[PDB]
Design a protein around this ligand. Sequence first.
Ligand SMILES: CCCCCCCC/C=C\CCCCCCCC(=O)OC[C@H](O)CO
Ligand SMILES: CCCCCCCC/C=C\CCCCCCCC(=O)OC[C@H](O)CO
Ligand SMILES: CCCCCCCC/C=C\CCCCCCCC(=O)OC[C@H](O)CO
Ligand SMILES: *C/C=C(C)/C=C/C=C(C)/C=C/C1=C(C)CCCC1(C)C
Ligand SMILES: *C/C=C(C)/C=C/C=C(C)/C=C/C1=C(C)CCCC1(C)C
Ligand SMILES: *C/C=C(C)/C=C/C=C(C)/C=C/C1=C(C)CCCC1(C)C
Ligand SMILES: *C/C=C(C)/C=C/C=C(C)/C=C/C1=C(C)CCCC1(C)C
Ligand SMILES: *C/C=C(C)/C=C/C=C(C)/C=C/C1=C(C)CCCC1(C)C
Ligand SMILES: CCCCCCCCO[C@@H]1O[C@H](CO)[C@@H](O)[C@H](O)[C@H]1O
Ligand SMILES: CCCCCCCCO[C@@H]1O[C@H](CO)[C@@H](O)[C@H](O)[C@H]1O
Ligand SMILES: CCCCCCCCO[C@@H]1O[C@H](CO)[C@@H](O)[C@H](O)[C@H]1O
Ligand SMILES: CCCCCCCCO[C@@H]1O[C@H](CO)[C@@H](O)[C@H](O)[C@H]1O
Ligand SMILES: CCCCCCCCO[C@@H]1O[C@H](CO)[C@@H](O)[C@H](O)[C@H]1O
Ligand code: NA
Ligand code: NA
Ligand code: NA
Ligand code: NA
Ligand code: NA
Ligand code: NA
Ligand code: NA
Ligand code: NA
Ligand code: NA
Ligand code: NA
Lengths: 273, 273, 273, 273, 273
Amino acid sequence: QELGNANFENFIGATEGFSEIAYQFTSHILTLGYAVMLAGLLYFILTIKNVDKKFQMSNILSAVVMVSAFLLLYAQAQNWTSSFTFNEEVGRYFLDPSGDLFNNGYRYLNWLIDVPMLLFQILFVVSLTTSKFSSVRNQFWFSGAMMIITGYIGQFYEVSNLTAFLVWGAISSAFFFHILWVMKKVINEGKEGISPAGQKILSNIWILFLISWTLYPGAYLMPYLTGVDGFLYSEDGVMARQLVYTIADVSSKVIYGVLLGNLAITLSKNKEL
Amino acid sequence: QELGNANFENFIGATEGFSEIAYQFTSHILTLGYAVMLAGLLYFILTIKNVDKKFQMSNILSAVVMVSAFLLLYAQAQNWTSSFTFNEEVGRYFLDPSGDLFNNGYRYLNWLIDVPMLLFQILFVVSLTTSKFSSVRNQFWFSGAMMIITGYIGQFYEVSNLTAFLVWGAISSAFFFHILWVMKKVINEGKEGISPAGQKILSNIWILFLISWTLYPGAYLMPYLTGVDGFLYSEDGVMARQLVYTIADVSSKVIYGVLLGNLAITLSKNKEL
Amino acid sequence: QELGNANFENFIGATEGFSEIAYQFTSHILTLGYAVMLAGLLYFILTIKNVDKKFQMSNILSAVVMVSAFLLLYAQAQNWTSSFTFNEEVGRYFLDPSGDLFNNGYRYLNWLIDVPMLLFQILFVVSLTTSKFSSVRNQFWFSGAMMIITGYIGQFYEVSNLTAFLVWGAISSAFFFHILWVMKKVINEGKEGISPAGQKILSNIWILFLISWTLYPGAYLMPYLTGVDGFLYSEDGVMARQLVYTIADVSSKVIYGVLLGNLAITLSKNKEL
Amino acid sequence: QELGNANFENFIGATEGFSEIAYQFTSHILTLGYAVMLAGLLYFILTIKNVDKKFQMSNILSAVVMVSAFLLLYAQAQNWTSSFTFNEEVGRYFLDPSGDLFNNGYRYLNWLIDVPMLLFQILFVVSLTTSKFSSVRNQFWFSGAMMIITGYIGQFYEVSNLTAFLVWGAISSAFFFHILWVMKKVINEGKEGISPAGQKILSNIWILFLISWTLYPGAYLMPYLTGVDGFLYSEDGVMARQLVYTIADVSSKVIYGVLLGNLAITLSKNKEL
Amino acid sequence: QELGNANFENFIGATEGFSEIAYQFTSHILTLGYAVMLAGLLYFILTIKNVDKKFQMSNILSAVVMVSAFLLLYAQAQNWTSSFTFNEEVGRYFLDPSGDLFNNGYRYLNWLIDVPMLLFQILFVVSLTTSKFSSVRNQFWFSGAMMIITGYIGQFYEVSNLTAFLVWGAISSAFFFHILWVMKKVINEGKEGISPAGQKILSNIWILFLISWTLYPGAYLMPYLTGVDGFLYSEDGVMARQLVYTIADVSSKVIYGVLLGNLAITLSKNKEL
Ligand SMILES: CCCCCCCC/C=C\CCCCCCCC(=O)OC[C@H](O)CO
Ligand SMILES: CCCCCCCC/C=C\CCCCCCCC(=O)OC[C@H](O)CO
Ligand SMILES: CCCCCCCC/C=C\CCCCCCCC(=O)OC[C@H](O)CO
Ligand SMILES: *C/C=C(C)/C=C/C=C(C)/C=C/C1=C(C)CCCC1(C)C
Ligand SMILES: *C/C=C(C)/C=C/C=C(C)/C=C/C1=C(C)CCCC1(C)C
Ligand SMILES: *C/C=C(C)/C=C/C=C(C)/C=C/C1=C(C)CCCC1(C)C
Ligand SMILES: *C/C=C(C)/C=C/C=C(C)/C=C/C1=C(C)CCCC1(C)C
Ligand SMILES: *C/C=C(C)/C=C/C=C(C)/C=C/C1=C(C)CCCC1(C)C
Ligand SMILES: CCCCCCCCO[C@@H]1O[C@H](CO)[C@@H](O)[C@H](O)[C@H]1O
Ligand SMILES: CCCCCCCCO[C@@H]1O[C@H](CO)[C@@H](O)[C@H](O)[C@H]1O
Ligand SMILES: CCCCCCCCO[C@@H]1O[C@H](CO)[C@@H](O)[C@H](O)[C@H]1O
Ligand SMILES: CCCCCCCCO[C@@H]1O[C@H](CO)[C@@H](O)[C@H](O)[C@H]1O
Ligand SMILES: CCCCCCCCO[C@@H]1O[C@H](CO)[C@@H](O)[C@H](O)[C@H]1O
Ligand code: NA
Ligand code: NA
Ligand code: NA
Ligand code: NA
Ligand code: NA
Ligand code: NA
Ligand code: NA
Ligand code: NA
Ligand code: NA
Ligand code: NA
């Protein structure tokens, strides 16, 4: 059976198949994912007036990201259940090509919304000092797009061409390091001339950002993090990848948005928190 | 046939199958469930302005839980009708593995929204005295997460390994007892320095909370509450489990939210009821 | 063919099948049903501020019922088209058990929202005199639940056990008569000490309530209202039942809600009719 | 192949089948239809505050009609693609009875919302001089209902019984002429005592109303407007019917609603166009 | 096999089929498309109050376009995955006629919303000088309709009749040039009597408009832009066409709407950027 430039989920599914626990867990974690995003959409809309007018764009951009993430995770939850079907003889779920092959690439192109908007929205809460707004925005958006597109190309080859997978991944990582660099400056400048309570929130935002964003390259490498024929090149690695994505999605989008909202409240003249 | 680590609904469905009443009732009760949650979402949004600004976060968190519960019960309603198909020869509904096995685990991971948010929202209505907000929140969220995850692992073994089922269930129960303990403190402190009308509502909330939350471990054990080859290890137990879930869902999420809203009104300077 | 405890729609569908007109009409009338409810949801939300704050809960409860009725009629519309499939050889639609048997019981459990909320909402518009709010509410909700649950059990036996059908129906009818009794008291007390305009609307509400609610037991009996092998034990009775449900649904939920809104306007100090 | 009392789309589909252009166009025009209605729903809600309070009910009733038309055209768009399936051997789309026969009757029962509400809403913008509001409303609603129900019965016989088709159509046309008569009076009285700009809009509304509403009986007769075995008794007539419906739907519901909104603005003390 | 007047996607799909990358990418880019539009819908609604009342109609018309584009791209995303199915033997996705042939014509008829509304909305932000509002609107709408309808007819013949394809395309292009001419006048008059900041935004809008709108005829010609049996008459051309549509959709609808919003803010007495 030729699968070509397909994600490793399809190779595990076509050879060993998935146990009840592996198949059900992956469905459950994607379902939790899209439920969090629709709940988050409601939260960010309903709390718009908790902050001064100038900060409300951050709530709006959080809502924009919630719409993207809800739609994508809802679609992927259906893609999972469509791509793997129970075999009564062996009692496992095997690749069902009539559902299409499963592909994580759905996430990557939707990041062309998420990444630009997540990076942009902090610039509506913090005030820059030494950095120029337009310059930070342009660097975030350029490096964001390049990081996503190079990684997108890479993940198609995660089984078919390990070399292409690692080279494209390495190129993507360079743009990622640039984003980390710029965001660190933005957090530092944001701390300047605000209450200590605001400064503490920005310290928390930086840690959240660094960990949550690093989880995505972690999900990229997941199948090979225990090397060739390792523990993770298995249904266990399939489960781990979607779990890491869901932790990263909730952390990078919802918790990030909530912390920015809390910062906006502290910076708001009327509001106290 | 080989079903592995699957819920007992699939064993009943694959051996005896379900009568018209058992199959239809389970579909009906899940449909009522998701209808209550979407109706509740509308209620919590439309009543936001019935309470002082400081209490409105409770309405918002109720709405967040309604989104989670609606999405999950809607999905599970479809999962039920997909997993069991009419056999014309015998006139009963039998396991249809092309629909996937039925799994209650969908509920468990979505509780990672419901439980944390339900426990959190009371802290936006009552005032603590001796207990610290952040400390109560952290205990609720840590013990809530551990209770859910341990029970989640357990329910996969409810047929395949009764020992694992009972041990994981027992560990989960310990975290549950801790939650009951902390919530009792919160209700007691909440009663201090408020009107007798408010105190009565908090007394009602405690009883509602204790009964509604205890129904979940009840649903966990349901198939075995009449022992080996008991009355409940049957389509009658399948019906009973989803009925208990729906009573618990409506009670723990909607009625809880309504009572908290009514408490917020009594604590609101402008508002009266 | 063995259908067990199934609604008579399935017996007609499995024996005679449905003509184009019978099949299409039943689909059309259910589609009109769910369209009216979603349109009504929009109407009740958009007119909230047309009445004094104290009356707005009636708009909210109308909206809650609209959500329930929309969801249920939308689901039942799909259930109808799934349960009956065209046979090319004879040119009629026959029972397709792969879609599941058709069951009116979906409506019954959703009445656990509709009935309690419809009975409750009038208590936010009229003022009681001799009766206590909590007492009327409790009687409405207790007798409402018992009426629904006993009728729900009954309708499963409408073909398989005419005796059980009529006995459960009779028990349900007793609870219905109690509801009619309590609602008559509520209307009488509501008329006391209000404008003639208000009194006229309450007279209209009583007639609407009495006729619209009585249509439901009419739908229950429909197949047998022309006796054994009568005109209505046919596709014509199948059509008649869903037509009566749709007239009852629109009358009891939407028109009732509109009249209560109009009553609220007349009782509103700020608002004018 | 026995189709019985079915619309002519099914006879063309079962005999000649549909070319790529005929099948795709019909799908496209229904898709445009439902898109216009959901976009219109948003427009009528967002512009509510552009007119004086007394005129806002017209926006609300426009929104109500948008909900009905969106739901119906969305359902019919799916019904079209379900009822006709590609035959690879000849490269045409043929009747697929597993999808159900296609029926325009879906539209007719939903007109029980559209027609009453479209006729009603003008009475919240114009002021009558000779005519009583309640009397005009009752005439519109009675004649609207009778026009719809008689036409609904007729269209089932458009192939099976040309005589029934034409007689029911003729009876329906009588009620239609009554509606045209009453609406002409309403427009004339509406022009009395308003600005010339308002009078011009009402002149436009009358022309729009007369043409857009006459398109519906045009769609009814479409297959036979070129006589027996004429050009229109073909895939070309199938296309023409749905095109005429979509022009009529957009004109009678959206453009009508926009012109009424524009009239309301001119009659509004605060507002100007 | 015989495909008749069908888009070239179906010819590639039926002969060579699509690689994993070609099939998945096309699905991903359409998914991004509809996600951007629903996120944009939320953005345009939530930012309505960021501009003076007189400019808010531009936000409303942006929202209207978002509804159209979301619905269309969502439907087309499903049409793509329905029209091509994995062949296990060769590991490619081939035409699945049971899903219907794929057709870009869905986009064209929905442009009867998008094009008229996009051209109209600028007239609620800029002030004309020498040109009449009604005259510019009428020219936009007439030439817009003719451009769309002629191109719509053309694209059905892109394989079956290259001559019809190029002639209808040429006629469509003439109406397009007229639109470019009128929009240039509108931009010029719009620049008169506004701040240099406003003039810069209008310069950007003109460039965006010219490039984004020209991408549509580019997508029309895509398969033949490398001549007969060129590189683009392939899965690579299929990918390129949907990529160009998505870039054009985001640019012409969302970015255009955002720039108009930014212009409205600069022209707003209360607000500043
Ligand atoms: C055994 C087979 C025969 C069965 C035939 C049944 C006949 C039922 C007739 C009337 C229902 C009256 C029920 C009483 C309603 C109780 C209301 C209630 O529970 O609320 C009390 C309220 O609080 C006050 O203070
Ligand atoms: C076959 C090759 C195609 C040739 C390419 C044609 C391009 C120009 C088309 C039309 C120009 C004028 C059309 C204007 C249509 C009416 C709108 C209008 O100008 O009227 C406004 C009214 O006067 C209120 O002020
Ligand atoms: C802005 C986003 C766009 C990104 C999407 C990329 C898709 C590339 C599309 C077109 C390039 C091809 C231009 C064609 C120029 C070559 C002409 C040619 O090859 O000659 C024709 C042939 O030789 C005579 O028979
Ligand atoms: C919610 C969406 C977010 C925050 C997306 C973030 C995505 C990344 C940080 C992706 C990074 C990658 C690498 C650093 C290397 C491998 C390829 C990527 C794109 C997964
Ligand atoms: C609406 C969601 C709610 C209130 C969820 C509550 C869940 C529980 C209280 C679960 C408790 C469990 C045990 C104590 C033992 C067995 C495993 C669990 C997780 C079902
Ligand atoms: C919109 C929902 C409403 C108003 C539901 C009303 C339901 C009833 C009045 C049901 C009555 C019944 C009987 C009195 C006898 C037979 C069984 C029932 C439940 C259909
Ligand atoms: C959007 C809904 C509208 C405006 C509905 C209008 C429907 C009609 C004017 C129908 C008229 C008919 C006749 C006059 C004869 C044939 C049967 C009808 C019902 C199509
Ligand atoms: C978002 C929708 C937009 C902006 C649509 C624009 C459509 C066009 C500019 C279409 C132009 C065409 C030609 C100039 C020639 C070929 C046929 C068309 C219709 C694609
Ligand atoms: C930085 C992390 C990258 C480490 C690369 C590890 C090389 C993995 O090696 C690969 O493992 C697969 C599954 O085990 C095998 O099927 C492949 O044949 C093999 O190339
Ligand atoms: C704390 C409540 C747990 C009670 C444990 C009951 C033990 C049931 O025992 C189990 O019952 C099943 C169904 O009858 C049988 O199929 C199994 O063989 C048997 O092990
Ligand atoms: C309306 C309340 C009383 C109704 C009782 C009517 C008795 C119905 O009688 C039933 O009729 C069915 C269809 O005709 C038959 O198939 C059954 O054999 C017969 O028991
Ligand atoms: C007012 C318009 C009514 C005209 C009705 C006359 C047309 C009836 O002609 C019908 O045409 C069908 C297809 O062309 C044939 O299949 C039928 O046999 C024939 O009766
Ligand atoms: C202005 C751009 C239009 C250029 C028209 C080029 C003519 C293309 O020629 C066509 O190429 C197809 C694909 O290779 C072939 O299948 C056709 O047989 C051939 O007619
Ligand atoms: Na599956
Ligand atoms: Na598929
Ligand atoms: Na089923
Ligand atoms: Na499946
Ligand atoms: Na069907
Ligand atoms: Na089924
Ligand atoms: Na089709
Ligand atoms: Na079907
Ligand atoms: Na596919
Ligand atoms: Na199909």
